[PDB]
Amino acid sequence: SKLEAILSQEVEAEIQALLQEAEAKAEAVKREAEEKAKALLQARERALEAQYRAALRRAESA
């Protein structure tokens, strides 16, 4: 039947829209997780090198 095929089309269209929305969501999720992890790694070179340099400052002064 026509509406046999049309309800099959509706199920396929809702599944395809569902998975496209899920693709956009998963891409934004891996984007935000990678941005947070790289903000971590960018902050850690500051948080470690500043400690190392201040240690050499006070060691040289001592």
Add this chain to the structure above:
Amino acid sequence: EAEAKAKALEAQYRERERAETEALLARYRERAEAEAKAVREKAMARLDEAVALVLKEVLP
């Protein structure tokens, strides 16, 4: 992987800190002993100019 690279860079730069700190401080110790010995050994031959001066200026 974030915790592993954090811990690895921590152990790496604390090894670096420890080794370069002790290598700096022992060298400053060596140069300090050398400077103290050098000023004492320069002053020893320089001495006996002083004792006559102070004993001349205290006494009338």
